Design a binder for this molecule. Structure first.
Ligand SMILES: CC(C)(C)C(=O)N[C@@H](C(=O)NO)c1ccc(-c2cc(F)c(F)c(F)c2)cc1
Ligand SMILES: [Mg+2]
Ligand SMILES: [Zn+2]
Length: 889
């Protein structure tokens, strides 16, 4: 198994200047003819000409129109085509080939494949070589001239990159289209689509040069009514890159296409963005609320790639975070501007500190720019993407908006049309840094450690206040735990956005201030501080770190009530919860270990419960923020703080804490649940797909969160509310009615009701599956078996498989059943899936990522299932590599 090392990058000895493709689609085969106009580079040392080509059936290959003979002049081993140097020309030459591929049986959804009745490609990262021979790496930039032919009745819509320059009829009911794309691109941005597509379209006029851009959004005919929000999001995206970054679109046309079968969310193929249907299609009748932010972010994300990925592209795959981290950052700026709700930023922090922190403390831990890889399909991680985004966002925190924009524009102007590396970006940011600090001596060399060093830093604090001197000190320390990537961790450049709150009146005591911590520790002193403050630390979550604020719960409560920063308020609440959770966990653990007949639990802080009531009852407070404060921290966030975590003991801890708070606040919950109804469920704009109200959706989030808390608690007659809720027109509401009914004898009645509502929309049925999957049911194993037999069957649709199984894996009490049966079940599904889609099989491994964090029995149970998977004769390269790394082999 070949391991690629970042330090080993060398340019190719060859050049590919022009690609000319003919893709002839038939029912039982697709014939691909390719002419590559090639040259010898300055790096050439007379080596063999080696192409990537995977699973290709050779009809013929030729050099300069002379047929090549297998054995004597070339060998093919189903992975590499080797042409021995003596037969390779020494100047400009043409290589051509004709191969047969089979998209119809291509269930791995990489290269060219059939999704329902759409033919579609996915070439990132190294899928182009599954379509035809190539030197399949992003620094091999070429021009593309692509002709697609197909049966006209089945595939009336033909798309590829660039301009459609010809359309023509073909004998036998076929029909062709030629696309010429003169600008250079890497092959992973190639795409082709064929199908009976229906569309919505609009014309966009760019801000500055007033270019007319045609916008098309496509789906299968059945779901053409679900395309409108995507189109609006695209317009929004274009406007944002114009307004914030001063960047306009450069092509005449942009196509977005939804397909039912897709490994991930979407792909940024130049002029032809291809989407998982669940990340493009929605309507208010047939989608839950979450779809609207999802489509906004994914449409935005692929649009922002047009600059950060497509126009400035990657030298090599080790630079992945340079396009992914930066594009997620651009997408997050966009989404925060469009939603105007503080929960948007909170939700990204929530995701980072739960999923990515777990990854960063697991045996899979890697820096955002790794030093090596075996499987590229395993490289697309929350670390590379979301920690990557936070590292890109820190530049903005450090520079401030004006100098950030200057630096970003330096980066684009300098590297537009070329490949780039993480260093090129840091260099651009550094120029701005020099300007901001006003001396050419300032530099960001230390900042590069954010790209190379793995692990989450820990930042802790001590405070001192001299009342007579009016002098306040914040002493700060940073620490990263050694891991397999660095024995010795170095101090990072950590920007700490801070405020100082006067606890007597809640006012700000200093102006906007960002502490630049560049050492292992430092002491920051503030003069003319009139009274002892409460520090508001890492406002906006200003660095991706473990914050150890060393504040009392009294101080945290004061911040939660009166601080100006949504993240610090939410974090203060989070920290109060975590202290409570750790304390009760240990009390429950000791009672278990010592087999106590009786014991005491520390109650939840009453002043904390009082503050929650206060915020909940404040008519001016944010609905989304409210739903965060009544929710305990995610299980995967909690596990970062506990060794040998016993999941049962944690389930008992959560239970006690929720019951403590509900025993005091349920009447408040109920009252709010009722009074929120009118605005939350307002139907005024239900038939206007262009009208999306994120505040109103947050109000429904709060109601559905409250209803969940009231149902678990068996609040008097809450079942009445549940039943009425099931009649709501909003799927967020009537699907919530299914999951909260788990605690009642009406569960299977709502099961059937909601199934009948969901079954005729592919995506809605997937949301139904998720709802069932995450239901808090004692008979959840029997229910999963029912889904398998009645609904899922032998679907190879990744959306179906992920919907049935992943939410169940977050069932703390049941997935982690001490028999190991949940581990057994998921491993069976992974092995089954790995036979046809190794990438999705590896995604289904996610629950095992925390295996060495659990109590020793469950470690052993998980490890056994992983070793059983590893011993499957037919295990994919993807899955083997992943489990080998995960189990420290
Ligand atoms: C949901 C997110 C936004 C994280 C997503 O869909 N990411 C894709 C992306 O960044 N789009 O711009 C994405 C796209 C392709 C791949 C990808 C990588 C491979 F190696 C494959 F084989 C493949 F099929 C897809 C992974 C993630
Ligand atoms: Mg289907
Ligand atoms: Zn991306």
């Amino acid at each position: 198994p070949k391991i690629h090392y970042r330090k080993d990058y060398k340019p190719s000895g060859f050049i590919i200047n022009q690609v000319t493709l003919n893709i002839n689609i038939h029912d039982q085969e697709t014939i691909v003819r390719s002419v590559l106009d090639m040259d010898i580079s300055k790096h050439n040392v007379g080596e063999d000409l080696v192409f990537d080509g995977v699973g290709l059936k050779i009809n013929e290959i030729s050099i300069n129109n002379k047929k090549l003979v297998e054995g004597e002049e070339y060998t093919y081993d189903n992975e590499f085509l080797t042409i021995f140097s003596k037969f390779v020309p020494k100047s400009k030459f043409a290589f051509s080939s004709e191969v047969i591929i089979h998209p119809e049986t291509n269930y791995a959804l990489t290269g060219l494949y059939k999704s329902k009745n759409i033919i579609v490609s996915q070439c990132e990262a190294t899928g182009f070589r599954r379509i035809t021979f190539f030197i399949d790496r992003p620094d091999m930039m070429a021009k593309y001239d692509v002709t697609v032919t197909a049966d006209k009745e089945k595939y009336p819509v033909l798309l590829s990159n660039g301009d459609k320059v010809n359309e023509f009829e073909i004998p036998g009911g076929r029909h062709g289209a030629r696309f010429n794309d003169p600008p250079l691109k890497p092959c992973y941005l190639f795409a082709v689509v064929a199908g009976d597509l229906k569309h919505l379209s609009a014309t966009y006029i760019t801000k500055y040069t007033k270019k007319k851009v045609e916008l098309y959004v496509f789906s299968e005919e059945k779901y053409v009514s679900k395309l409108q929000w995507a189109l609006e999001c695209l317009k929004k995206s274009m406007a944002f890159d114009e307004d914030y970054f001063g960047l306009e679109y450069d092509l005449s046309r942009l196509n977005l296409v939804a397909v039912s079968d897709f490994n991930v969310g979407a792909m940024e193929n130049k002029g032809l963005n291809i989407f998982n249907a669940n990340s493009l299609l929605a309507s208010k009748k047939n989608s839950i609320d979450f779809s609207y932010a999802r489509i906004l972010t994914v449409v935005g994300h692929e649009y922002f790639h047009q600059y950060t990925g497509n126009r400035v592209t990657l030298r090599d795959w080790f630079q992945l975070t340079l396009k992914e981290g930066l594009t997620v950052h651009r997408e997050n700026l966009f989404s925060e501007e469009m939603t105007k709700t503080v929960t948007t930023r909170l939700s990204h922090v929530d995701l980072l500190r739960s999923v990515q922190f777990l990854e960063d403390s697991s045996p899979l831990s890697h820096p955002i720019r790794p030093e090596s890889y075996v499987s590229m399909e395993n490289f697309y991680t929350t670390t590379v993407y979301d920690k990557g985004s936070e590292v890109m966002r820190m530049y903005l925190t450090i520079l401030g908006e004006e100098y950030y924009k200057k630096g970003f524009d330096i980066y684009i102007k300098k590297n537009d049309g070329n490949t780039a590396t993480c260093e090129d970006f840091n260099y651009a940011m550094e120029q701005a840094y020099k300007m901001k600090k006003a001396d050419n001596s300032a530099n960001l060399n230390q900042y590069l450690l954010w790209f190379s060093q793995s692990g989450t830093p820990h930042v802790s604090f001590k405070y001192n206040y001299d009342a007579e001197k009016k002098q306040y000190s914040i002493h700060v320390n940073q620490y990263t735990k050694p891991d397999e990537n660095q024995k010795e961790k170095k101090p990072l450049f950590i920007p700490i956005s801070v405020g100082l709150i006067n606890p007597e009146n809640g006012k700000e005591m200093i102006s906007q201030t960002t502490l630049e911590l560049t050492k292992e520790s430092d002491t920051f002193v503030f003069n003319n501080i009139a009274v002892k403050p409460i520090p508001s630390l890492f406002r906006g979550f200003s660095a991706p770190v473990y914050i150890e604020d060393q504040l009392t719960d009294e101080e945290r409560i004061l911040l939660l009530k009166y601080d100006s920063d949504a993240f610090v308020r939410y974090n203060s609440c989070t920290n109060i919860y975590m202290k409570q959770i750790l304390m009760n966990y240990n009390e429950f653990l000791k009672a278990k270990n010592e087999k106590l007949e009786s014991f005491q639990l520390t109650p939840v802080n009453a002043q904390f419960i009082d503050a929650i009531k206060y915020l909940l009852e404040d008519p001016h407070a944010d609905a989304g923020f409210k739903s965060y404060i009544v929710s305990l921290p995610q299980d995967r966030y909690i596990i970062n703080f506990v060794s040998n975590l016993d999941t049962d003991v944690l389930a008992d801890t959560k239970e006690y804490i929720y019951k403590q708070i509900g025993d005091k606040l349920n009447d408040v919950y109920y009252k709010m649940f009722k009074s929120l109804e009118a605005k939350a469920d307002d139907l005024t704009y239900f038939n206007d797909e262009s009208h999306v109200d994120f505040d109103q959706m947050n109000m429904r989030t709060l109601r559905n969160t409250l209803l969940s808390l009231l149902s678990k608690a068996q609040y008097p007659n809450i079942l009445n509310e549940i039943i009425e809720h099931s009649k709501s027109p909003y799927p967020s509401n009537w699907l919530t009615s299914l999951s909260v009914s788990a605690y009642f004898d009406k569960y299977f009645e709502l099961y059937d009701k909601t199934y009948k509502l969901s079954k005729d929309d592919e995506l809605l049925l997937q949301e139904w599956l998720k709802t069932v999957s995450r239901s808090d049911r004692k008979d959840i194993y029997e229910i999963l078996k029912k889904l398998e037999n009645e609904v899922l069957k032998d679907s190879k649709n990744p959306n179906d498989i992920r919907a049935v199984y992943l939410p169940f894996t977050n069932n703390l009490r049941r997935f982690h059943d001490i028999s190991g049966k949940g581990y057994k079940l998921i491993a069976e599904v992974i092995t089954k899936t790995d036979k046809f889609n190794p990438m999705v099989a590896t995604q289904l491994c996610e629950p095992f990522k925390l295996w060495n964090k659990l109590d020793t029995k469950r470690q052993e149970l998980m490890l056994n299932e992983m070793n059983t998977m590893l011993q499957e004769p037919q295990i994919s390269n993807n899955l083997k590599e992943y489990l080998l790394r995960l189990t420290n082999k």
